[PDB]
Amino acid sequence: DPVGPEQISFLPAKLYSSLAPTALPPGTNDWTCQPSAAHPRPVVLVHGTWANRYDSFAMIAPHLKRAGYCVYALNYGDENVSVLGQLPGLYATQTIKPAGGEISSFVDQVLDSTGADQVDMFGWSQGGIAARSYLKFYGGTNAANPAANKVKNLITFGATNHGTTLSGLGALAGQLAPATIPPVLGPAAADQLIDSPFLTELNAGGDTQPGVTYTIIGSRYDEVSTPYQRTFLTAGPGATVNNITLQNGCEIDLSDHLSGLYSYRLVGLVKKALDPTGNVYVPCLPNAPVLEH
Amino acid sequence: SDPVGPEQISFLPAKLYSSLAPTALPPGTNDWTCQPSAAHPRPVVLVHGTWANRYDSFAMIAPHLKRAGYCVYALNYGDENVSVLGQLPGLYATQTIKPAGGEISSFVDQVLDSTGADQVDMFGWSQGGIAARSYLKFYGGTNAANPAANKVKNLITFGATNHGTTLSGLGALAGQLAPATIPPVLGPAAADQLIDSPFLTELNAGGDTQPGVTYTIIGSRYDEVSTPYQRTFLTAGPGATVNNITLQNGCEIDLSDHLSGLYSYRLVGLVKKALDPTGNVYVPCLPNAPVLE
Ligand SMILES: CCCCCCCC/C=C/CCCCCCCC(=O)O
Numbered sequence A: 001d002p003v004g005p006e007q008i009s010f011l012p013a014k015l016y017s018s019l020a021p022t023a024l025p026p027g028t029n030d031w032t033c034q035p036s037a038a039h040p041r042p043v044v045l046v047h048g049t050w051a052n053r054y055d056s057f058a059m060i061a062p063h064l065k066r067a068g069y070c071v072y073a074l075n076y077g078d079e080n081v082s083v084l085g086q087l088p089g090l091y092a093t094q095t096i097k098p099a100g101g102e103i104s105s106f107v108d109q110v111l112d113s114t115g116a117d118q119v120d121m122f123g124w125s126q127g128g129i130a131a132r133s134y135l136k137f138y139g140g141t142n143a144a145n146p147a148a149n150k151v152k153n154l155i156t157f158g159a160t161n162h163g164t165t166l167s168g169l170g171a172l173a174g175q176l177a178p179a180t181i182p183p184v185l186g187p188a189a190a191d192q193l194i195d196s197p198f199l200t201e202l203n204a205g206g207d208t209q210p211g212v213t214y215t216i217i218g219s220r221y222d223e224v225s226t227p228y229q230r231t232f233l234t235a236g237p238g239a240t241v242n243n244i245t246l247q248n249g250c251e252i253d254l255s256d257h258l259s260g261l262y263s264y265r266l267v268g269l270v271k272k273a274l275d276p277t278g279n280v281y282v283p284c285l286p287n288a289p290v291l292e293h
Numbered sequence B: 001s002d003p004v005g006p007e008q009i010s011f012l013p014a015k016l017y018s019s020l021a022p023t024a025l026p027p028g029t030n031d032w033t034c035q036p037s038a039a040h041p042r043p044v045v046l047v048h049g050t051w052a053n054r055y056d057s058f059a060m061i062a063p064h065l066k067r068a069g070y071c072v073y074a075l076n077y078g079d080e081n082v083s084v085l086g087q088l089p090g091l092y093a094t095q096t097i098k099p100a101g102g103e104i105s106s107f108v109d110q111v112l113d114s115t116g117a118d119q120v121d122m123f124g125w126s127q128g129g130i131a132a133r134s135y136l137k138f139y140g141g142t143n144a145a146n147p148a149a150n151k152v153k154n155l156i157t158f159g160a161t162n163h164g165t166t167l168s169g170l171g172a173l174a175g176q177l178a179p180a181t182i183p184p185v186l187g188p189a190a191a192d193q194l195i196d197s198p199f200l201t202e203l204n205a206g207g208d209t210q211p212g213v214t215y216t217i218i219g220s221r222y223d224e225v226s227t228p229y230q231r232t233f234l235t236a237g238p239g240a241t242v243n244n245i246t247l248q249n250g251c252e253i254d255l256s257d258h259l260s261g262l263y264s265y266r267l268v269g270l271v272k273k274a275l276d277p278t279g280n281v282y283v284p285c286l287p288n289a290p291v292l293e
């Protein structure tokens, strides 16, 4: 409902969201927006674990708006049982599969409001696999008639597409018992570990659904979703996969799991994937991690 | 409250460790067989900060003090289970601050009994400093009739919120916090550390010091949690000494913030020198980074 200001760094945006947990980023969920000729498809942004639409997209969303897209973002996976779930603005703690249902409702609203046939979708971290749930289980895709898919492009950053070894926690990654973390961390934390039930089910039979064009971006220095290459997808029949290492061609971009959202290079990569025939400017600028290394 | 963790050299790995073992002791600490030597006859008691514990706070300071020849002791205090943050593992000192003095009294008595010593020296990080001052003022850490028999001889602090904080790291967002809505979320300790809070008012009423105590009060120019940083400094009352130290004086490359610099070699030297004035302690000057970029 309220609109917060444009941001350039993740933790300031998070702090703002902790006092305004339902805020929208600039340029987002204007339900009067009409797709243009250059950009027929609305863009749906899907946040990550313990995050919201504001702290995830307070830079990406304004940039996509200035580029001429209609931009939309939901908040999802909200629950109040886990400890972290009780903190303001930490969403997407609920077990992940039903996220696809929430996304479906939202996407229907967006299509309904814009008269477009399809949307494009960007997902951060859990967002990505939440989006894939929608693709696989909740009608994002149409197995019998791929051309009718409601999602045309899935773009993701840091997505835990095949779970994470949590390499950044060092020796502590293995001490995490999948059974004791839900009450504290929330079930989604457990759903993103290696070979979780949800990920075995999500990946059973393949990474892709036909018709969808996937752009899967990872950062070398991501230490939340690890090894970082596990984010990459393998194309199945009738699908396209472009896996991008954020650093190939720009080693001075040191984005991590969080700072990648405020990297001008990542925004460029996203805009490129959204407008492949458009000569998009993909910068190569420095960007730092959140922590000092 | 007796598993011993490894020495650490960075704060966040220590905090992570503690989250899986929230009663861990830093090395060299709470050996109740330890007898103070003649060169260092006072035990050292370490008092942690808000949302912290003895491990993440002193997993560097304690091993270093132990190798310098002190008997080292540390407690966890201010544990409550009503606030949301208070429910997370190893985030202690969320309870309202004043009564922490009482816990410290208990602990100090067990230390004196265990070692035959007349006094202790004490070190406090952030809330630990004013919690320590609570003990000094309201729970018998000082003796008005006979200051010579104060149970505490030295109080050394770092980043202590001795006169409350403006939270300048939050910029204009700090003015947006409502002191009545944060207790349930962050713990009453957070509200007690705000400027002119009831607790700080009663604690500082009538002066910063008690007779017979030597105060070494350290702040860092880059501390942006206990702000303005100079507010930590104390004014000497009657029968008291205050040595107000800015960590960056004589070493502008030490860029420690509120958390790092618990892991600064310079800070550790400063504390060792305050403990051993006549001992020609080496105080290095070395580069140390903030926790964030
Ligand atoms: C150093 C990497 C360790 C693994 C990363 C784990 C935490 C990453 C969280 C990213 C989202 C924003 C953080 C806010 C919620 C913190 C909860 C937590 O620390 O588990």
Ligand SMILES: CCCCCCCC/C=C/CCCCCCCC(=O)O
Pocket: A049, A125, A126, A160, A164, A166, A169, A176, A177, A179, A180, A181, A184, A185, A189, A192, A193, A224, A225, B016, B019, B020, B089
């Ligand atoms: C993208 C998936 C991210 C999952 C990361 C979750 C783990 C990161 C570590 C967080 C600190 C450890 C949390 C401690 C909770 C233990 C609770 C318990 O079982 O008692």
Ligand SMILES: CCCCCCCC/C=C/CCCCCCCC(=O)O
Pocket: A015, A018, A019, A088, B050, B161, B165, B167, B177, B178, B181, B182, B185, B186, B190, B191, B193, B194, B225
């Ligand atoms: C949902 C209830 C809203 C009321 C406020 C909730 C606060 C959540 C945000 C906290 C940001 C950090 C505030 C830091 C104050 C700590 C004071 C200190 O450590 O000295």
Ligand SMILES: CCCCCCCC/C=C/CCCCCCCC(=O)O
Pocket: B015, B050, B051, B052, B167, B168, B169, B170, B222, B223, B224, B225, B257, B258, B259, B291
């Ligand atoms: C969770 C363990 C951390 C212990 C203390 C945490 C401090 C939380 C307070 C945040 C409000 C202050 C604004 C942050 C500025 C960061 C600069 C610094 O750390 O010195």
Ligand SMILES: *[C@@H]1O[C@H](CO)[C@@H](O)[C@H](O)[C@H]1NC(C)=O
Pocket: A232, A233, A234, A235, A241, A242, A243, A244
């Ligand atoms: C995406 O990753 C798969 C394997 O994980 C690889 O076969 C494929 O070539 C990659 N695609 C691109 C465009 O890099």
Ligand SMILES: *[C@@H]1O[C@H](CO)[C@@H](O)[C@H](O)[C@H]1NC(C)=O
Pocket: B233, B234, B235, B236, B242, B243, B244, B245
């Ligand atoms: C801090 O202590 C110094 C001595 O180190 C003293 O001269 C000064 O007055 C004190 N500062 C304050 C604000 O009391």
Ligand SMILES: [Ca+2]
Pocket: A078, A079, A080, A085, A086, A087, A090, A091
């Ligand atoms: Ca919630």
Ligand SMILES: [Ca+2]
Pocket: B049, B050, B125, B126, B127, B225, B258
């Ligand atoms: Ca503190």
